[PDB]
Amino acid sequence: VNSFSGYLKLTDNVYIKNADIVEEAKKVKPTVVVNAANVYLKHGGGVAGALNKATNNAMQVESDDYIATNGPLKVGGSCVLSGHNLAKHCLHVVGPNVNKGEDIQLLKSAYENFNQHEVLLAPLLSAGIFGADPIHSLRVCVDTVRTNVYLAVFDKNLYDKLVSSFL
Ligand SMILES: Cc1[nH]c2ncnc(N[C@@H]3CCCC3(C)C)c2c1C
């Protein structure tokens, strides 16, 4: 039993809710919140911009030190950093950004990072400003993640379409 509330159950391990991931993280304080990161951990917009704003830019400060030490992530890769005031940990996961020409096949690799964590709060990878079809992202999530994932979908209209079209 965990503290996630109001989710529709899609499969044995995948749950979904129309929610602002920032407000959901602040309420649940999950062990792991997933960020929709880029390889530079530049949290300017989309989910990343919103999460970073909620940490008062502390996420960005930590991220800049990480990059200065380690260099950029790989598309499809991830790193674990602090969750600041939102979660114990933040798993920064880089899905392919279609608006940069990146291979959508890397979306499966991106979701594989979730399997290293028993329970996660997460957005749909490569959705929103990353330009992929959120319906496809949900399909890849369901077919790749085996651990317990609680998906937050900001847009109510998109949430309803994802549910109604789910196979
Ligand atoms: C402030 C905020 N909180 C969120 N929580 C979850 N998902 C979000 N965006 C999704 C990602 C992919 C599709 C979408 C509807 C843009 C958000 C945003 C913008």
- By DSSP bridging, strand 148-153 and strand 119-122 are parallel
For ligand 1, is residue 152 a contact (CB within 6 Å)? yes
> Please, what are the domains in the chain?
8-163 (3.40.220.10)
For ligand 1, is residue 134 a contact (CB within 6 Å)? yes
Instruction: Give the distance, in angstroms, between the CA of residue 90 and the centroid of all CA atoms in the same chain.
Output: 9
**Ligand 1 centre and the CA of 154: distance in Å?**
4
Sheet containing 8-9: order of strands: 8-9, 14-18, 148-153, 119-122, 32-36, 89-93, 78-82
Compute the distance between CA of residue 125 and CA of residue 123 in angstroms, rounded to an integer. Answer: 6
Residues in Cβ contact with 143 at an 8 Å cutoff, skipping those fewer than 6 apart: 108
For ligand 1, is residue 47 a contact (CB within 6 Å)? yes
For ligand 1, is residue 22 a contact (CB within 6 Å)? yes
User: What are φ and ψ of residue 76, in 5° steps?
Assistant: 95, -10
Dump the DSSP string for the chain. Answer: --S--SPEE-SSSEEEEE--HHHHHHHH--SEEEEE--TT----SHHHHHHHHHTTTHHHHHHHHHHHHH-PPPTT-EEEEE-TTT-SEEEEE----GGGT--TTHHHHHHHGGGGSSEEEEPPTT-GGG---HHHHHHHHHHH--SEEEEEE--HHHHHHHHHT--
Instruction: Give the distance, in angstroms, between the CA of residue 49 and the centroid of all CA atoms in the same chain.
Output: 12
**Ligand 1 centre and the CA of 17: distance in Å?**
11
Contact 93, 36 (CB under 8 A): yes
User: What are φ and ψ of residue 57, in 5° steps?
Assistant: 75, 5
Compute the distance between CA of residue 73 and CA of residue 121 in angstroms, rounded to an integer. Answer: 21
**Ligand 1: nearest atom to the Cα of 36:** 11
Compute the distance between CA of residue 103 and CA of residue 75 in angstroms, rounded to an integer. Answer: 9
**Ligand 1 centre and the CA of 54: distance in Å?**
14
Instruction: Give the distance, in angstroms, between the CA of residue 12 and the centroid of all CA atoms in the same chain.
Output: 19
